[PDB]
């Protein structure tokens, strides 16, 4: 059964870093079998937040597709969103949204 970090939206200090830990203490058993892990990082002119949840990849999230769901790691990809910097990733190995990676792995 898929396990994912699920702290919903939290402030974060993740910034100017190649990768970041979610610092979410909630590892959850996703309530539906097809759900995968998701992480959303956003920075507006005031703060940075990191959202972690379970989510069905057949459904949009923040109106975007979770195109990378089969991936075992959460590789952040930028989405166009006015007034802020928005990055998102999905993945499907246990607690994979606990480590978010910006740009590709070395």
């Amino acid at each position: 059964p898929q396990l994912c970090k699920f702290c919903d939206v939290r402030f974060s200090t993740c910034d100017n870093q190649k990768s970041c830990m979610s610092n979410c203490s909630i590892t959850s058993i996703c309530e539906k079998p097809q759900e995968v892990c998701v992480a959303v990082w956003r920075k507006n002119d005031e703060n940075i937040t990191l959202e972690t949840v379970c989510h069905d990849p057949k459904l949009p999230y923040h109106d975007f597709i979770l195109e990378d769901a089969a991936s075992p790691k959460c590789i952040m990809k930028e989405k166009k969103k006015p007034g802020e910097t928005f990055f998102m990733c999905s993945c499907s190995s246990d607690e994979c949204n606990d480590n978010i990676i910006f740009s590709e792995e070395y």
Binding site: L3, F6, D8, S25, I26, T27, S28, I29, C30, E31, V53, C54, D94, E95
Partner: protein
């Protein structure tokens, strides 16, 4: 020495491979150990094994919803020869 409960702490993630238990992180499961008598008083000689097993209360999440429940026979409370 004789047969009795020996303390043993079990860590869910490290020892059971369970990454979904939110609290506690582990617990005293304990085990039975110790000599027993050659013969029986009501194959092989008697062994030191658990007698009373108690349950453990844990907290975990399904989706964003916390759930408090209990697993039975997680804690060895007493041992017996047999």
């Amino acid at each position: 020495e004789n047969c009795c409960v020996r303390p043993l702490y079990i860590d869910f993630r490290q020892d059971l491979g369970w990454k979904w238990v939110h609290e506690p992180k582990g617990y005293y499961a304990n085990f039975c150990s110790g000599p027993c008598p050659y013969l029986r008083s009501a194959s092989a000689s008697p062994c030191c094994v658990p007698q009373d097993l108690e349950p453990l209360t844990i907290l975990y999440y399904v989706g964003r919803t916390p759930k408090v429940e209990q697993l039975s026979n997680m804690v060895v409370k007493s041992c017996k020869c047999s």
